[PDB]
Amino acid sequence: SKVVVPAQGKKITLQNGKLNVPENPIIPYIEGDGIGVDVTPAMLKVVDAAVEKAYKGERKISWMEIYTGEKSTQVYGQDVWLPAETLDLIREYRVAIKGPLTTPVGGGIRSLLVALRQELDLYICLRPVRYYQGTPSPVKHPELTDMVIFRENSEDIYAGIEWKADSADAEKVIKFLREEMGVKKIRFPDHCGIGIKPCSEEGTKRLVRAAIEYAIANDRDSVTLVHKGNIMKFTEGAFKDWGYQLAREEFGGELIDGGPWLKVKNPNTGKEIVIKDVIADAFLQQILLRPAEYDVIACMNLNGDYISDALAAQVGGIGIAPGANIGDECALFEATHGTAPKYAGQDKVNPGSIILSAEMMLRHMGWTEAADLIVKGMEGAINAKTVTYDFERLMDGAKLLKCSEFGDAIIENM
Amino acid sequence: SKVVVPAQGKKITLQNGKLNVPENPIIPYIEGDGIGVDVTPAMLKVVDAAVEKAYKGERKISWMEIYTGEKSTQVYGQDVWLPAETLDLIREYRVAIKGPLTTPVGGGIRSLLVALRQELDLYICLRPVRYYQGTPSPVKHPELTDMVIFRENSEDIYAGIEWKADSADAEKVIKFLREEMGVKKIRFPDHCGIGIKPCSEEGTKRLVRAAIEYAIANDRDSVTLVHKGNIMKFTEGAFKDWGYQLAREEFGGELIDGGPWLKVKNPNTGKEIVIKDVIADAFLQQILLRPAEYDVIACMNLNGDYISDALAAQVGGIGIAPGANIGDECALFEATHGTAPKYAGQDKVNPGSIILSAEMMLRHMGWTEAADLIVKGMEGAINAKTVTYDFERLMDGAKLLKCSEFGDAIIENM
Ligand SMILES: [Mg+2]
Ligand SMILES: [Mg+2]
């Protein structure tokens, strides 16, 4: 209704599991709030340059702006933070990319990003974190990190099922728990907020299946289920068990020496994939002390939220970390950082997260060559120390570049 | 009934908030399972040596072994993992210390450590983490870390209120939620485990009050409330709000320039304490990238579990990290690592966590001089590179010591 669907350009098709991508696909993008105004222009410029370079003019993307967040209230009206047509358009055009979003406070509006993820049932939050040589890191050996985070995106405490303290509803569910379920474990039932953590068999098996398949297709060495299952037996503990059962039942997992770990043989390379588990607080130590031991990681919503941020900080990449939300019918690639409004319009922040989420987008489309030119671009620019302020602060001998100029620097190293 | 209460020795008294400690107090200790057999002897030896040195023979501790875990089934019988008299004795004798505990699987027995904490309402899990010069660390600047973790210990998802998937009870509470509470947010209601997260006003204000008081008494620079309140509004979001309200209402917190942060003036040094908050996944990046910005940390049960492990790993201290569980009527100091059964009896693991929890125990008793001789001992031994296998593996020029020998090394540097 306010989106101008491009004249030239053809929709991507989902031909039974397989993406049928035309030479001129229409890709929707959400600019995003704050620094979205800076980083999204830089990304459209390097993606265009990468598909121009690789397919020598044969392929072109028709970009189509759609709306969510604060820019949406300016286009559709003060009340509409998430237009229903954004939800239809992402689903229809199949892949889309977004910058950072602002969710308001004081209006009872829950995370606009969690709403997109859940409404479109984009159940896989895929977050690859690896070190780019030369970015400044807080740890001695960041090059030992090359992990891929499969974070469940549709259940856990993120479902948003909770009630306020002293509210009638909170009184009612605490009443049900104490009277009809006989729970005596609530220390203070008065002035008490209540939240519900769900975890289901379908929910975890579809995520773990996506993770083990990724391990076979890219012949990764292991899949690690992280959980706090010793304290949360029937949610986190059930996640670990249902994940081992899926490895046994669907991938022919066999005990590695008395268990509990399994071995899945990669049907293509013949190598064995180790299916293991590690408790979540111990895992937060292990990624710092022994990061070479881990590779593909499968976990629930909140733990993947913590794991992926903790892990992006140690390889010096809190500003260049990519992300994808993938479902069976569509995908939404995204900048994983915030809106940072103080810097908005200044052309100074790192466009690296949204650009690397764009390589993930192209790789998803099967435009592998274009996608490889962007990580070549990135490696080159960082290595040239021709970098943006957040990296330059920590480097000796670096040249300071604007957001846009670092866009040009990536194209220069392609 | 199987505990031999010491002939000489006098109980500590709680004379209205104040601990009245005799010159010969009876202190209960739980040896612990696995490597407890190694580390607890080393700790009794350096604590004895420290009180001998400081008070030149005037004060003495009468140690009294009590039982929990696997050693308890050997003393009281196969069925008793936690004897009720352990719970009475800790409460009566007021302070106690413990090594690592084994909780069994297959018997429906939940964490024996969480049972002690909750049964005795030891609502403060205090975890100080600071760098000891010379211990090997994975990060470039571990010396910038000197934080104190006030982790809430009586509520959150740790309360243990959950139901199995496909169980009658799980079906019943999912029925109540959908039918009587009208929740439509459960993606898969079939084959679904359910957990309950509670958070109350009394629960968080008593923890935050303990944290801000610690900041005044040791004139620390700030108190940081970490939470995932944007997604969990009525539990984690309520924790942040109730904590700021307690700073306003009880400590005279005033807005630092338009808010949201507050300033509390230390009534004793005149310095201002900054009361701030940071979202939990961003905090996991911030402790790695900017650890000098943070000091006393207040948080809920699961986030403090993750924060304290993540933080102990970066200063090279996963094996020398101390801990305390403090309530209004008693305290249980503890080794924060596991039982590590493969090494049990070999006299090879680090006795540093339980020894540093013993300095925390003495400091609690008011035996400050004894307590200061142990951290002097520790600093000396580590600096001398006269260390145990876990540190020696990562050091060049170190002398390898047994668990017991490192006990003697601490006494040697006192
Ligand atoms: Mg996050
Ligand atoms: Mg822990």
Side-chain angles (χ1 to χ4, degrees), chain A residues 78 80-179 181-183 185-201 203-256 258-270 272-328 330-341 343-349:
Chain A
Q78 238 91 237
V80 30
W81 289 90
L82 172 50
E85 82 164 306
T86 288
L87 292 169
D88 297 329
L89 269 3
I90 295 171
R91 184 153 53 205
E92 191 183 296
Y93 289 93
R94 305 287 154 164
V95 320
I97 187 166
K98 63 162 213 63
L101 266 28
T102 294
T103 305
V105 326
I109 296 161
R110 291 183 167 279
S111 178
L112 292 178
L113 171 54
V114 174
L116 286 163
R117 297 177 170 162
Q118 294 181 347
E119 224 63 273
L120 296 164
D121 199 39
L122 306 179
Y123 71 85
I124 293 155
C125 184
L126 179 56
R127 282 182 172 165
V129 10
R130 66 104 153 168
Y131 181 65
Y132 280 75
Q133 206 55 60
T135 102
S137 169
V139 311
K140 319 281 192 65
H141 289 295
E143 78 280 346
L144 290 183
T145 298
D146 191 329
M147 306 190 198
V148 187
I149 313 302
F150 273 82
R151 164 201 184 179
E152 200 293 321
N153 235 15
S154 75
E155 1 178 81
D156 210 349
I157 204 74
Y158 277 67
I161 308 154
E162 51 171 3
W163 303 279
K164 225 187 107 165
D166 295 313
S167 71
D169 289 329
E171 267 82 278
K172 181 182 175 177
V173 325
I174 293 174
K175 180 107 104 58
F176 174 74
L177 292 170
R178 295 215 284 136
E179 282 172 21
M181 302 308 307
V183 311
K185 287 172 145 188
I186 302 178
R187 189 54 267 260
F188 302 108
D190 277 38
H191 307 283
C192 188
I194 298 289
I196 308 300
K197 182 187 172 79
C199 179
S200 70
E201 184 177 27
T204 118
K205 307 264 242 212
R206 61 172 182 184
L207 175 96
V208 182
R209 182 182 298 124
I212 298 178
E213 286 180 343
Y214 182 94
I216 289 162
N218 301 283
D219 75 305
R220 304 300 307 215
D221 304 84
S222 57
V223 177
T224 298
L225 287 1
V226 342
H227 65 98
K228 188 61 186 180
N230 53 333
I231 301 297
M232 284 168 275
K233 294 177 178 180
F234 304 136
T235 49
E236 302 252 345
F239 180 85
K240 162 243 185 63
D241 289 334
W242 284 320
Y244 271 130
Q245 166 170 95
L246 184 113
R248 280 190 278 118
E249 288 172 13
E250 283 183 31
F251 289 88
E254 287 165 62
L255 285 192
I256 299 176
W261 299 357
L262 263 29
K263 246 167 194 292
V264 166
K265 220 189 95 300
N266 190 326
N268 307 319
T269 61
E272 293 178 311
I273 302 167
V274 174
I275 309 297
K276 49 182 184 180
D277 75 281
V278 49
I279 304 296
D281 54 343
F283 183 68
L284 246 36
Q285 306 189 305
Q286 282 299 92
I287 57 185
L288 209 48
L289 276 8
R290 285 153 83 190
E293 243 79 276
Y294 303 95
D295 186 339
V296 181
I297 306 300
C299 58
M300 281 167 74
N301 219 329
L302 195 68
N303 289 337
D305 182 50
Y306 292 179
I307 309 308
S308 52
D309 269 42
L311 226 27
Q314 79 187 48
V315 295
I318 60 170
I320 59 171
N325 301 278
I326 298 163
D328 293 329
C330 52
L332 175 66
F333 298 87
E334 66 176 337
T336 63
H337 62 65
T339 58
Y343 297 128
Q346 284 176 37
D347 194 32
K348 60 126 58 61
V349 294

Side-chain angles (χ1 to χ4, degrees), chain B residues 162-177:
Chain B
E162 51 171 3
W163 303 279
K164 225 187 107 165
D166 295 313
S167 71
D169 289 329
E171 267 82 278
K172 181 182 175 177
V173 325
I174 293 174
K175 180 107 104 58
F176 174 74
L177 292 170

Side-chain angles (χ1 to χ4, degrees), chain B residues 215-227:
Chain B
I216 289 162
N218 301 283
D219 75 305
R220 304 300 307 215
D221 304 84
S222 57
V223 177
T224 298
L225 287 1
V226 342
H227 65 98

Side-chain angles (χ1 to χ4, degrees), chain B residues 179 181-183 185-201 203-256:
Chain B
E179 282 172 21
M181 302 308 307
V183 311
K185 287 172 145 188
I186 302 178
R187 189 54 267 260
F188 302 108
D190 277 38
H191 307 283
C192 188
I194 298 289
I196 308 300
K197 182 187 172 79
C199 179
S200 70
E201 184 177 27
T204 118
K205 307 264 242 212
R206 61 172 182 184
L207 175 96
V208 182
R209 182 182 298 124
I212 298 178
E213 286 180 343
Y214 182 94
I216 289 162
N218 301 283
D219 75 305
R220 304 300 307 215
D221 304 84
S222 57
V223 177
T224 298
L225 287 1
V226 342
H227 65 98
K228 188 61 186 180
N230 53 333
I231 301 297
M232 284 168 275
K233 294 177 178 180
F234 304 136
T235 49
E236 302 252 345
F239 180 85
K240 162 243 185 63
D241 289 334
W242 284 320
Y244 271 130
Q245 166 170 95
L246 184 113
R248 280 190 278 118
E249 288 172 13
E250 283 183 31
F251 289 88
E254 287 165 62
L255 285 192
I256 299 176

Side-chain angles (χ1 to χ4, degrees), chain A residues 228 281, chain B residues 127 151 305 308-309 336:
Chain A
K228 188 61 186 180
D281 54 343
Chain B
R127 282 182 172 165
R151 164 201 184 179
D305 182 50
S308 52
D309 269 42
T336 63

